[PDB]
């Protein structure tokens, strides 16, 4: 069960810029050749977003170290991560992140997504452990590193995977009306963010933490190593804010262009006319 995988501190706050990325179809209603203006929780243009290094290696000098933080969800979250290796499996969203309240668990595996809203006693350092089943001759995944006790399940949703050269994955999370609304676009490496699912979970979402997968390290006799290491991983988190946007829909319905009206006086002039 729970592994006590703490490093001294998240010392550097890493930042970057969200040039034009967080534009999500705010409604599912098809419109054609139109200029629809909406006030909604968008990612502001040229916002300063944060680069998180979750698994960040120490060169020839040292082995890797682990800094996966619990983060606020505030009013919304733009998530982004371009990764070759299935290290980022999902997220946990919730309030207390212990039993006292319920919380949301989103874990994506090679066959399926599992989405759960249930009272989880989350381990203080959370991950999904992948181990070798000698009989099967395949590696298999254990969820009990994430949660040690499961109680009071109201929601279970199992479906086809989303997160599964480098393939940028972009996500927008909202929790409004008791409805966890998820928007997603994958990009192999201007682009519409197209809705994934609206889950009726009906819970308070105030904070979240990324879910990471750590292969078991079958150590030789003398190592003092953790026993849980898997590749390297990094991700980008930004926060949605209330904004009026002018979205331009195609003849085919596609959002070809959008403008943040509060960014600069020119964008306001395009907005008013």
């Amino acid at each position: 069960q729970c592994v006590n995988l703490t490093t001294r501190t998240q010392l550097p706050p890493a930042y970057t810029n969200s040039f034009t990325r967080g534009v999500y179809y705010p409604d599912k209603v098809f419109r054609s050749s139109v200029l629809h203006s909406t006030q909604d929780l968008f990612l502001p243009f040229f916002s300063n977003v944060t680069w998180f290094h979750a698994i960040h290696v120490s060169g020839t000098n040292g082995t890797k170290r682990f800094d996966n933080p619990v983060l606020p969800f505030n009013d919304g979250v733009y998530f982004a991560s371009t990764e070759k290796s299935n290290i980022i499996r999902g997220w946990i969203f919730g309030t207390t992140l212990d039993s006292k309240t319920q919380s949301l668990l989103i874990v994506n595996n090679a066959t399926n997504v599992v989405i759960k809203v249930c009272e989880f006693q989350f381990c203080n350092d959370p991950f999904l452990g992948v181990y070798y089943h000698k009989n099967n001759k395949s590696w298999m995944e254990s969820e009990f590193r994430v949660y040690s006790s499961a109680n009071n399940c109201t929601f279970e949703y199992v479906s086809q995977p989303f997160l599964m050269f480098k393939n940028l994955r972009e996500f927008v999370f909202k929790n409004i009306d008791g409805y966890f609304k998820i928007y997603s676009k994958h990009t192999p490496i201007f682009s519409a963010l197209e809705p994934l699912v609206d889950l009726p979970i009906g819970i308070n979402i105030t904070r979240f933490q990324t879910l990471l997968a750590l292969h078991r390290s079958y150590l030789t006799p003398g190592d003092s190593s953790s026993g849980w290491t898997a590749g390297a991983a990094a991700y980008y988190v930004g926060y949605l804010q209330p904004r009026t946007f002018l979205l331009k829909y195609n003849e085919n319905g596609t959002i070809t262009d959008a403008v943040d009206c509060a960014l600069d006086p020119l964008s306001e002039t395009k907005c008013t006319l």
Partner: antibody
Amino acid sequence: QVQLVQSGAEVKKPGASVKVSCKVSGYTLIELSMHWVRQAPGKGLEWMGGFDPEDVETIYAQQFQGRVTMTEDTSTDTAYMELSSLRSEDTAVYYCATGWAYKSTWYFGYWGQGTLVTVSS
Amino acid sequence: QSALTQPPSASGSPGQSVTISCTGTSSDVGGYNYVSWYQQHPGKAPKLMIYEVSKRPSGVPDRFSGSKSGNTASLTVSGLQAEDEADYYCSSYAGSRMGFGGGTKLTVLG
């Protein structure tokens, strides 16, 4: 690290049957293959049998055919080894050892303290 | 049991280097690189010293190193210190079986 703790020593008479346990800690039984060897007084190590990682099938050495039987219980994390038709030659210390299954590098990294089976009428 | 051939004793003055050889066939030591080496102090359970032919587990000092040539492997113990007086057992996969071989007693000569 993995830690292997065996059953206490036992005394038997010729013709009897003996069963030795082996409790594994630190890593669960389904992640590491189990092999049993024995050492007679002063003599060398002799492989009794083990588990083939690539071909999932316990392997028994030619010496102990239809006479040894090795079983594992994954829930209790305990490995078992039953030897029937005991005779004075079987008087030895019996070690349970372990090698990783993924790599299959046939290196018995970790050993039990040993179980002394003493056969004498 | 006795599948691999390995000498009865190994003499060495302290500080010197000793080499214990483990001789097999093309089907056990000559066919694979799955050779291993084990120390054993008297009345005490064995201990791994060399894994995968040349590799060494941590905590084992630098002075132990092994290799193989043709059908014969060998363990070499330099910087002889009295902690090394023990029996030394080699081991290797035979394709269907894993068989330890004989013994050898380093005798730190005093």
